[model samples]
Target chain A: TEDQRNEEKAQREANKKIEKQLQKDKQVYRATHRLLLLGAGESGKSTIVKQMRILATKVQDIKNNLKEAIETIVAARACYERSNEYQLIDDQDLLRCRIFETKFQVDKVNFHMFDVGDERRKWIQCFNDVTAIIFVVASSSYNMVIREDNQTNRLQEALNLFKSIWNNRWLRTISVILFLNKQDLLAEKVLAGKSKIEDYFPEFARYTTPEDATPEPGEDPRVTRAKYFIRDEFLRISTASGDGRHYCYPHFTCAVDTENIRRVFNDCRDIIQRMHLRQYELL
Target chain B: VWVVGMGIVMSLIVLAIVFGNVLVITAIAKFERLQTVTNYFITSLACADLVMGLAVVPFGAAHILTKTWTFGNFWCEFWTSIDVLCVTASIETLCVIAVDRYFAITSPFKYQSLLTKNKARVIILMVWIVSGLTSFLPIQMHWYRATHQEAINCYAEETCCDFFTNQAYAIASSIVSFYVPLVIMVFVYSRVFQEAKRQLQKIDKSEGRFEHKALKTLGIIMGTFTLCWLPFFIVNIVHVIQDNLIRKEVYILLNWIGYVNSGFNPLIYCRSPDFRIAFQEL
Candidate 1:
């Protein structure tokens, strides 16, 4: 009995020491947050990743994104001015492009970028420990439909997908930094008046502009109204609760614009730092 | 035999009150993780309840069983003043907590801006100051009694000593300390409950596996406070108007329920995961 008691005491001490060490490591691991980039397919999520690459891949990576954008605009067929034909072919006559799965670091912050379309549910379990999720949405896709489901609107799909992600059980405590991306396309689309947002979303007709919205320098009031309307739709789902375990922060982004992404990303750094402090109970 | 039984039971309550509040105080003080604006408010509340346990309840419990005051005239005024002071601090802290929660839920984006650590500390200081003004200032100066020597007479005769005598004093004190806080808590918590439901319905009407029970905890917190103190306040008001409206035993029993509230809040702190973890860690 004496021997057994002595052995048990030693084991308990060893276990206690291991627990103390694990807690220290956990604190350090939390210091370097893992940011997961999530969005519906073709929402300029990859563009944001490539923009991060500019902050961090290759010249070919940039060319591929450029080719894809030109091809995508051409596929729609309405905006095919066809005047700058040689500029498009100078880069890639070979194939379609994708911002393939890449994990990179900038300023000691890790950003995990990947594509998850309809199978986003399958990837959620893998991201339980992610510090935050950057949910990107293409604001100009209001009038567009999903490629797979031709009847469903792309913005509607993005909204549904975002709701699912925001309400995920595992990600409840993780804050969502929303990137309402493709502001450049959205602004152009609004200015062109080729496809009115009201044609797709009838509610846009009566939706008044928010008082807090201060349009960017030289930004049109009409574009601000359209962008703010899209922002509020997602916010309606996110801020529906007066209280929750987590919060959603929305920012207007143009993923292809390097300076724009840099400013927006710097803003996100403060939010992520505050979120990290909250997670470790420091805040 | 019955008096002995009651003594033991009341003594146990006093111990429980002390133990529960001290546990909360120690948990917040010792654990760095439990230091938040909310936890700071909770610690202030625990301090008030701790004083209730240590300086107020034991003497009151002795009087409850023995039906007399033997702790001397000066101690009578002092203990009664402390009882009022602690109760006022506790209720005011709960009121501040309700407002804090309101800002946290409704304007989460600006919650830090709205209620910072410095702001919370100032609020806590104000809570104690207001409690002291309403309790010790009046009671100590003999301004709380209808007849200046009424409490002194009770003590000289070695009979039961009551806290308040003037109807005006009871009305003002009850309104300031109890009724206003109660109304604020009810209004704030109802709004929070409705918002909780709205948020859940907006998301998935089917499932809220994690944060769904916020309403339940909030209801319990509010319900427990109302149930415990409502009867005591009602009886206090009526007793001033008609001295024999409630029998002594019944009134004392209801007052015991109010005393239970001092210990009760610590149990509600268990609803939070951090507090639960800290309690266990300690």
Candidate 2:
């Protein structure tokens, strides 16, 4: 009985130590890696977020997705009025207010992502605090050939907002991650191999060049060149688990390259290191 | 099969209720001389009940028959939105009538000034607007669709009703539309009945056959309203709190039971001998 009591006391002490360590780890994470998630309401921002949480091992699959789904429905309804058919009502505004925080983490890299509602006024406030922004667009909607102009306009608006926010002096060099979500809806189209993102964003045509494959030394390429040649800012991701609906399909293309996001972060890291070096030199 | 039968019965009950209430409203409007402060309330209640019975009962019937809604997603949303609005309006009207009766009996002289025709119309309009705005607003924002399981039948798939997941919205609606009105109705009716009892005791002599007849008519109206509707209100609360406990049969049954109230009120109040005689003599 005495031995059991002693063992139980030891287990409790160990658990307390581990919990304290975790709190310290979270504090350090909060001080460092901050993220900002951006997307239209019901464009799968919350769902992808929960998936990210699961991938990060911050929460189990069941817990995160439930809330994510709930937020998705609420945001979709809230933003329903901006479309041509439905008029947004006062009750919808109330539902939009219900949208709040959803958090996830991956080891030492903490993600402070906002799965925000598509209430336009609220979007302006979130811009300053966010370090890296993830723009989630539904692939079914984005890649459709018929609504190309609509898609382009949406893309332009999103980019303009990002540029405006990131260009601020206090919030310089923000990384942007573009996720082309809802590949499940694009399954039949993808299976026919009849779909292409290039058709939707014909701007992709101008960026194609054989010589531009490799970057040359000390030469800043044209803006259109960066736009076209930039291969890694966009990523295609689907929450659905199946062979046909998976994000790894050959036809799927990302608008904002993931590599570009990494490069932006690298640039920020380099700037911080250089700043530290300059301070030492001054001393 | 049992659920389907129940649904059909409920639909019939709803049709009867709607038809009967229409008759009551038409009779009161046509016989203008019979119009009084109390008739104003009766007319309003009939109209609210008529809307609920007409709009919602058929939708419920259709839902029961086609467990899976093959109708485009938008109709599903619209139907649910209308259902909530009409039901809430009807309940609110009942509560308003109770308050009206209480004021009339407790303070007859002051009742006329306090519950003027204009003020009563405004209150009725407010009830409708509040109910419609509350019910329709959230639905526009939310995207929900129903799914059918093969085992359940092609028609009987899982109908994903939007806003079911919104706990705050659900709670708010429950409070404003049902609970508060229910409480107010109980309080008002209790006071009205108690005052009516005192008034009867003070009467030294029989006023006439006419007075006795009028009292009987009023008793029948209130008694029918309570008996036909009380079970529905109680069951509705139970359904709200422990919804999963009841199956499809219970819902259909309760729905029909509620709809019967619409039919009963008209027969008891509008077709009463005193009411008919009063209209004819006036």
Candidate 3:
């Protein structure tokens, strides 16, 4: 009777601990993966999110991350842009945040994504605790252009965003990914023009190469050199098609030759890994 | 026998217009919300039709049955004057209604301001004054002359008015009272139809109940007006153009048809749910 009582007590305690730990894990996962997506109204953000949801389940570990990403994208897309402000919150005051959790034998990672409204004020708040940023721009290949000079000033806004993010030391380590969506429209032009990404980015060209072969101080030669590397890695994706039909340089069908989306992920992964390693080493 | 039958038909027609128009007026009065400036014109039209039924129908019926004016020379003139005045007033009221409906549908927001109560009252007063002046002056001028018949000894003492076919008088009366009003109604109703078409297009595919009801109301209004008055007006014009060849039977028929016009307005225009409720209260 004494032996049976001990065994039964052990089983009860084990079950209680397991349930408690499960609840804790769920809360942590939810908190970590909170994501916000931001975009202009009618920018196909909702469509992109819906497509991501459809594509998520098949992606294994990234399923939750994909769902969160889709939500953020949709929220951003639906954001109303009034004057210079964007409102992303619905009447219920719920922030469209997506959280994803992936765990292996001894490792767990949470991805939190947030969609900032298209408004300048809301967009300024996006840099807080942001691990990575995806800057989406319409493809130049698309003939649809906002011809109004006042509205076309969005390019200047983009440049200002880049400068602000770059100058902030806290966000300096954060990986930035530029998404030139609707790339299918530029397939022919991109092929004819040697598919040079540098040609498309005048700012990078002006800041990168030296006129006389002397590198400027404080500017890591790698920063300039990384442009070419990232350009080769640029993902010319329509995002709607996962079949790689809209990729830059369509002839290069290999997964390795594909756009910089993989590179962006790798870069972010490395930064996070290095930060953790340095912290452990310091401890 | 023919005259007696005609008199009975005429009295029935007069009763129809009188009671029918009274029903319309009462119905409108019962609905306090429907008492807008535009509705005043509708009320005026009904009032005109009521007067026509009361003053003109009986006298006209008497003239048809007796084949002679038994109400003396003064009454003959007075009866003719009242008939013309009532008809002219009715036509003018219809023209005003047409204009009101046109503005209402064309520009609903501004319609209330444009057709204010004061403005409508003024127009109505002017219509009655014009109708009275034109109808009574011609009668007082002894436009109808008594012609003596010596060939037939059967009625040596009897006097009959010489009914001259005056082209100018007929044209003036028709143009002033009917033709002009008809033209105005056509233009206004057409605009209303256009507005209705636009509103129908915007209506959700599922909720067409209101549009269907409105279409039915318009159909009945147009159908009744065309049926009751078109033949009479056409014959009146024909009689004026070829007075000598116009047979006595044709005149009798046209006269009956003209009286029938007063009868249909109540049944067609004032029989709506909106009117019924108003009548019940009255």
Candidate 4:
């Protein structure tokens, strides 16, 4: 009788402890809103980051990252004569692939944005954290062309990068939001009839995505397929690798376009708030 | 066609493991400023890895190459003792770092006082002692790993091999070293990460890199930690579910994968400024 009474007392105390933890977890959820922004080199990671800083009115805060981010594009734009040149300088700057960190507060919630250097070499360095992931890709930049003779598909390049990213176990639970940056470039390219998602990733169009995954009816099929292909490819890889299908959101935008980028950031803020709430509910 | 290619790959791995851990040890010891409580744990891990690289792995590699254990009964137990000790020590060192990082984030002002040079030395000593008790003593206790039958030089199958193992022992050791620590580290590091984000004002400063930066390094560390160990853990779980129908090929593959984890660790540490700075001085 005494032991049973003690056991009941212990259960009540344990329940109370967990009851207390709920509030702590909610606090934890709000405080640690982290986003790891990753993709291949020149994937507009810094651009999106600039967009974030600019959104937070923090463009002046970290002048060095601003300068470094700006210089990479400008420096490479002019470096056109030699090997591994023209494309980028961080390509060879052994350590430019190093991850850059920025944190800014908006409204009330704090956000940590990691501009995961896109160099496949340094990509491994960026695999981390929760709250959310902004998987940036420069859609239709054809400038993202990597040469290995045959398989130069830029879309394939993004798919291959996803294969490695999802292989990381820590990131399995995080919500990944795909930012297909350079949509402005895509608009111009399509008008000239130069680039189409189907031409590069024919295999993806062949796969039947579920009705739920399909884009709106009026949207172009190729663009729909391109976005879905990325989403599904990441889903397929994560599941195939033994981790479950993660929650991913994809957006199309140009980082230079502040209005559109600001809209995307608002969407991102909404996602983070809901995810943080979900995290606390589980706790 | 494949023999030479694999042989080269094998040799490179061997060279990397041996030189890599040794280099990490040398780097930390050579740099005076690196004598932090944090670097001490890293140094401790590197030492264990050094043991794996120098003593344990070469024999295992030879056995794999020769298709049998032939180094005698004395050496067989020797290899297992040292191997388990090294692996256990390596993980314990990680747990120590995780604990230190918890302090760094939770009570940044009190961390230096809480983890002093004297306390760090004691902790390092405690790590090795605990590893030895968990591993070296387990070999003698009968639950850890009971030595097999007698040594027969014929098919290369020896009696000193570990055929009899206890579920209690395996489960307990795994919990102590891997599962529990993994959970605790993951939970603690998240708090550290939250603390980093909470200081958003200071984040714009040069220390802005401070946000989730260490966690990223911790990520690579945990990534390698999980990648190598998960297979080994899964197989044990698999055998339990399958009623002891263990796949020998898969078992050997997973075991070796876990074994070579020590080699990858020092390389991962090189990703940091502390290691690089220490290494540069060396």
Best candidate according to TM-score: 1
Q: Which stretches of candidate 2 lie above 4 Å from their native place?
A: A1-283, B1-12, B66-68, B143-165, B204-244, B271-274, B277-282
Q: Model 2 over residues A1-283: C-alpha lDDT tens digits?
A: 9899979998999999999999767545445545566655445554554444443333455446557766655766446333322222212121122144655544333345555542244445546655556656554554322232433444444434544443445444344455555444444343444445466567766654544244445333432243322223232112122131111111123322222234324433433332222221110
* lDDT top scorer: 1
**Superposition error at B28 for model 2 (Å):** 3.1
Q: Write the per-residue lDDT of candidate 1 for residues B190-229, one digit (tens) a residue.
A: 8867766655454452222224356557657778988999
lDDT of each: 0.70, 0.52, 0.53, 0.62
> In candidate 2 chain A, where is summed lDDT lowest over 10 consecutive residues?
A242-251
**TM-score of every model versus the real structure:** 0.58, 0.40, 0.47, 0.46
Question: Of models 1 and 2, which has the larger DockQ?
Answer: 1
After TM-score superposition, what is the CA distance of residue A14 in candidate 1 from its true location, in Å?
42
lDDT of 4 by residue, A1-283 (tens): 9899979998999899999999567645545567676677656666556556654334344456658768766655334333122344331221123269998876555667766542435544445555566777766654345655334755567777876766665566666676677665565555445444456556755776555554667667655655555455544654454322354455566555664534545555545443332321111
Error of 3 at B181 (Å): 1.5
Q: Predictions ranked by TM-score, top down?
A: 1, 3, 4, 2
Worst window of 10 by summed lDDT in candidate 1 chain B: B203-212
Error of model 3, residue A170, in angstroms: 56
Once fitted onto the true fold, the runs of candidate 3 whose alpha carbons sit more than 4 angstroms away are A1-283, B1-10, B27-34, B143-165, B204-217
Better of 2 and 4 by TM-score: 4
Docking class of 3: incorrect
DockQ of each: 0.04, 0.00, 0.00, 0.01
